[PDB]
Subunit: 82 residues, 3 copies
Amino acid sequence: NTQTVLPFTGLNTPSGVAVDSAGTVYVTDRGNNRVVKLAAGSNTQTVLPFTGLNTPSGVAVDSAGTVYVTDRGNNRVVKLAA
Amino acid sequence: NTQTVLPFTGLNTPSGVAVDSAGTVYVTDRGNNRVVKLAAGSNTQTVLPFTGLNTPSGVAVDSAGTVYVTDRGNNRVVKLAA
Amino acid sequence: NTQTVLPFTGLNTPSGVAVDSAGTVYVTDRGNNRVVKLAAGSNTQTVLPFTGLNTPSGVAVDSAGTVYVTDRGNNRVVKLAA
């Protein structure tokens, strides 16, 4: 009977979420053309250094911490190693 | 090449899906402002006790069974313990 | 910290992404009403034999390689075995 709002900042219509084995939460912040992440316990998000994103629609993270993003408005899929 | 339609009911423009190590299937039922799940070997939907969602867009689950949802219409990310 | 563009071809407004334990990447190619997959280390995708999708919105893959898709326009969730 408890839900928790995560302390992300300045999201605009977030489109997708993933979480890695360390508990870091990754979010496609669609309306801001960026991907943000928040480590478990952390109070401050960091912005992943993707470039040229256009309304990213979704995100996945693998066992190696590689982050995959559907860059919807650019008809492509990008990834970034940890 | 036979696909199977899962026995979810009453969905309205479902927006996202996650499956965990136990084979439980979680779905953001966007048009009904809710998240639903179906365990493996189960036929019956349960609605997750999130509250105040608005057109949720995506869902993720960690190894501990914690469910994370991008609550798109409210510009926030919410989580629920197992 | 530099992104890589994955060698998918012909995508149209992709909506979601999943990655399995082998590093195979699965994408809901929303604008083409299909789901594509790219084997690890491959530059040539295949199309999964789902049927009658309409605006697929998200994808997940379990430990057994079963692929689950939210078929937004048909208010259903479908799955295909590996």
